[PDB]
Design a protein around this ligand. Structure first.
Ligand SMILES: O=c1[nH]c(=O)n([C@@H]2O[C@H](COP(=O)(O)O)[C@@H](O)[C@H]2O)cc1I
Lengths: 112, 115
């Protein structure tokens, strides 16, 4: 879409890509908050989870299954945290839906 | 007792009381007993899955449904400034109940990093 994540999807700027298929992309976060911190994003430009449609359900779930598989591939056998931010209170940094996966350290509570 | 004997399995079968927000055939949303934000609820599948690391490929629609229900409930609860969704996986995630669930937190500014 019209965000930096759109540019990454279109391969116009670099990112360290972990996995790709026909409908999503996983890549390491440029500002990592844990020893392992990556994103899984849909190629479809959904700007934020609050405007996702019902028929996007399987796609959103796909982001989580891809996140699961990438986490295992990156050796996160002790677990991890998945995060989706919505809007200003959620601290959403880019208006393209993205699933964070963080691990490689103890995650704490509250989650921000 | 379909769904198992974790506290969440029991909540699904109405054996333990909870403050329910939304219910359909696939999931249940209820308020967290130890809220970490002014609004803090959980969305859980009625199907018992212990954690994300063992979810099946065909669980995709269900997992997405948790997020769609999470976002709909957030709107119904007036979280118009946004919110954060969280899944805690395993020990490093700090998981305490091994029945998959999505947290939805809002009503205050959430901070970075997310724990
Ligand atoms: O009866 C319960 N009701 C609850 O709402 N919870 C919450 O479920 C969460 C369990 O921790 P976890 O890290 O998400 O697995 C935590 O936020 C608890 O306060 C835990 C139990 I046990």
């Amino acid at each position: 879409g019209d965000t930096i994540f759109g540019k990454i999807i279109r391969k116009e700027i670099p990112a360290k890509i972990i996995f790709e298929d026909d409908r999503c992309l996983a890549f390491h976060d440029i500002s990592p908050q844990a020893p392992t911190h990556f994103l899984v994003i849909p190629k479809k430009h959904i700007s934020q989870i609050s405007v996702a449609e019902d028929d996007d359900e399987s796609l959103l779930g796909h982001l989580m299954i891809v996140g699961k598989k990438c986490a295992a591939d990156l050796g996160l056998n002790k677990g991890y945290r998945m995060v989706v931010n919505e809007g200003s209170d959620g601290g959403q940094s880019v208006y393209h839906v993205h699933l964070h996966v963080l691990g490689g350290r103890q995650m704490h509570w509250p989650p921000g």
